[PDB]
Amino acid sequence: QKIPVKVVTWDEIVSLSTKLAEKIKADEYNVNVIVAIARGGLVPARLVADVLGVFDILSIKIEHWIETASHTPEAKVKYPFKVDLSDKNVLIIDDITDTGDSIELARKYVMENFRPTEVKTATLQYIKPAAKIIPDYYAEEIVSWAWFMYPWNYWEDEINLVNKILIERKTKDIDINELKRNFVESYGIENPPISLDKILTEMKRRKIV
């Protein structure tokens, strides 16, 4: 019932994004167009583009669906479109390769619909034990599964982590102090980037509580 959670800072994102770009430099892959996987790849896409000198970034939104009875997972491009990237070297970017389901779909999608000369894949992180497909480049190998909390995800991640606690509670409990204590117990996070009272307020606004 504990979940391993790792808080990632902006300094780490800069550091990881730069290291990722350096691998691509060293490999002398000449990137013309970066395709970001939305939403997780937008930020790393931009930073890699800055270091490598890539002017053209596009994005595709990938949704993840689960069938209730079978527990079957399915990944889908939402708002799919076509453009002509023939004559271009494409780099697909996302934040993390977990199962590898996302970069697998992105790669197929891009090859069929953008028809680029070449395609490669890159993510900041790569979970060795979990990944069915290995991205062509990654900045950091992860050998033990954890949930990575990115700085562009602090609100949503904390909202979901709070929710996971609240639905266990047999009797409602507003004592923010209980909530904070559980957060430490369950997630190992003594100081959430966004304070839990702010998270609660926002959950109310959204009609989540």
Q: Between residue 83 and residue 102, which ones bind ligand ADE under the rule CB under 6 A?
A: 96, 98
Annotated binding residue at 144? no
Choose the contact partner of 81 out of ligand ADE, a copy of itself, none; CB within 5 to 8 A by kind.
a copy of itself
Q: Which amino acid is at 55?
A: F
Answer yes or no whether residue 53 interacts with a copy of itself by CB under 8 A.
yes
Q: What is d(CA 164, CA 172) in angstroms, rounded to the nearest whole number?
A: 13
Q: What is d(CA 168, CA 76) in angstroms, rounded to the nearest whole number?
A: 31
- Given candidates 27, 56, 74, 185, which one binds a copy of itself under the rule CB under 8 A? 56
* Shorter beta-carbon distance to ligand ADE: residue 34 or 94: 94
Answer yes or no whether residue 39 interacts with a copy of itself by CB under 8 A.
yes
Choose the contact partner of 55 out of ligand ADE, a copy of itself, none; CB within 5 to 8 A by kind.
a copy of itself
* Shorter beta-carbon distance to ligand ADE: residue 100 or 116: 100
Q: What is d(CA 34, CA 45) in angstroms, rounded to the nearest whole number?
A: 7
Binding residues for ligand ADE, how many (CB under 6 A)? 4
Answer yes or no whether residue 8 interacts with a copy of itself by CB under 8 A.
no
CA 181 distance to own-chain centroid: 27
Annotated binding residue at 98? yes
- Given candidates 39, 52, 75, 147, which one binds ligand ADE under the rule CB under 6 A? 147
Q: Minimum distance from CB of 125 to ligand ADE (Å)?
A: 8
Annotated binding residue at 114? no
Answer yes or no whether residue 148 interacts with ligand ADE by CB under 6 A.
yes
Annotated binding residue at 123? no
Residues that constitute the known binding site: 95, 98-100, 102-103, 146, 148
Binding-site members for ADP are 95, 98-100, 102-103, 146, 148
Give the residues lining the site for ligand ADE (CB under 6 A): 96, 98, 147-148
